[PDB]
Amino acid sequence: DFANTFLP
Amino acid sequence: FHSLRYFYTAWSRPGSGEPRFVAVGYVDDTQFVRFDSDNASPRAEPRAPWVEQQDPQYWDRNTRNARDAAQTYRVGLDNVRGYYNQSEAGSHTIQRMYGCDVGPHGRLLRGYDQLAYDGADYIALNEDLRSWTAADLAAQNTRRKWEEAGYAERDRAYLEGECVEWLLKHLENGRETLLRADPPKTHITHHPISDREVTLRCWALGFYPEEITLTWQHDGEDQTQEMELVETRPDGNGAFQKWAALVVPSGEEQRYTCHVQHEGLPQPLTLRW
Amino acid sequence: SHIQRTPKIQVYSRHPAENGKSNFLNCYVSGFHPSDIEVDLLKNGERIEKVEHSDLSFSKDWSFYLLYYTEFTPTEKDEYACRVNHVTLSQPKIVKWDRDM
């Protein structure tokens, strides 16, 4: 699975 | 011993539509998944024969994850452009590289999550998987927000959890492709330039994984500074190529040997014309 | 684009070139930044119609790499080349195919 993506 | 690696690229195209987002995943040196936001109704798609048999919920789940990541970096591109106070008329890029290296025991060796902005380090998860290193002042903006939100803990849970478990599933489902060590097919070619000088080129073809060592020796003395060594390239079929060439006097070809080291070779190879 | 890098270019075939036998012509572009790039494969100076390319990825230093490839059958006097344009290049780069490289 892809990981969670965090808003810069 | 093995690694699961994901690469995200997001960039803006001022005047030419929304930003674009592309993601790819690899197990070691073999790609197995892609996502492209420029597709209409974009999906995460298999890019390896072995990963195809994965349950349909895997592809539905990762499609919604990738679409959400794409939306997040579209807004993120404006956030970071604003921190640097850059013009909206310029194109800029956010990249992300994350994954895990697993050892023989089936446990985490190292996890990582790094972002770049315009081709330079922006923020990176530290090796303790609990704190962030920001590369400049603008990246401190991101760093403060990610600390207060506690995102390092979500990274740690993924890297020490799902990442390892998914690397091991992929390794088993693609064992015949991923657990091979194909040696190179090696030969030397011979290209006369003049009556006194010729080019010797030592080839390594069709090998996997990408790591290889190619060297020329002149009566046993290394010739690295005299030789031309090209960067390792994909052959298009899931393997790699490389060569090293050397200009040699027209009667002295026999005094030179090429040496090839690679994982699939039981012993290192020595070739000579 | 703060840090920009011009691409390296290699043009080669998947298998060693034997005339009259089907092969693949490869143009490998690597080490560039940013990601937008124009790669064309030329036969005798004219762009080849069906050219595919790998999915965009990048290396440890964040520089991008792409493989462009097309099915082809090498002959003795047919000339093949790769034309690359990029924001770092004031003029396009054309690298000819050389079956010995």
Residue numbers in the entry:
A (entry chain C): 1 to 8
B (entry chain A): 2 to 274
C (entry chain B): -1 to 99
Task: List sentences from the manuscript.
Major histocompatibility complex (MHC) class I molecules (MHC I) present antigen peptides to the surface of antigen presenting cells (APCs) to active T cells through interaction with T-cell receptors (TCRs), which play pivotal roles in antiviral defense. In this study, we screened bat MHC I Ptal-N*01:01–binding peptides from different bat-borne viruses (HeV, EBOV, MERS-CoV, and H17N10) and determined the structures of bat MHC class I complexed with these viral peptides. The overall structures of Ptal-N*01:01 display the common characteristics of classical MHC I molecules in other mammals, with the extracellular region of the heavy chain folding into three different domains. The α1 and α2 domains construct a typical PBG that contains two α1-helices and eight β-sheets, and the α3 domain and β2m display typical immunoglobulin (Ig) domains and underpin the peptide binding domain.
To further investigate the role of the 3-aa insertion in the peptide binding and presentation of Ptal-N*01:01, we constructed the Ptal-N*01:01(-3aa) mutant, which deleted the 3-aa insertion. The structure of Ptal-N*01:01(-3aa)/HeV1 displayed a shortened α1-helix that is similar to the human HLA-A*0201. Meanwhile, although the salt bridge was still observed between Arg65 of Ptal-N*01:01 and the P1-Asp, both the Arg65 and P1-Asp displayed a conformational shift. One of the hydrogen bonds between the two residues Arg65 (Residue Arg62 in the mutant) and the P1-Asp of HeV1 was lost, and the remaining two hydrogen bonds extended from 2.97 to 3.23 Å and 2.67 to 2.72 Å, respectively. We also investigated whether the 3-aa deletion of Ptal-N*01:01 influenced binding ability to the peptides. Ptal-N*01:01(-3aa) was still renatured in the presence of peptide HeV1 but with a much lower yield of the heterotrimer complex. CD spectroscopy also indicated a weaker binding of Ptal-N*01:01(-3aa) with the peptide. Either depletion of the three inserted residues (Met52Asp53Leu54) or substitution of the P1-Asp with Ala impaired the MHC/peptide binding. Although these three peptides have a typical motif of Ptal-N*01:01–binding peptides, the N-terminal extension led to a failure in peptide binding. These data indicate that the 3-aa insertion into Ptal-N*01:01 leads to a more restrictive binding peptide selection for Ptal-N*01:01 but not an extension to longer peptides via the N terminus.
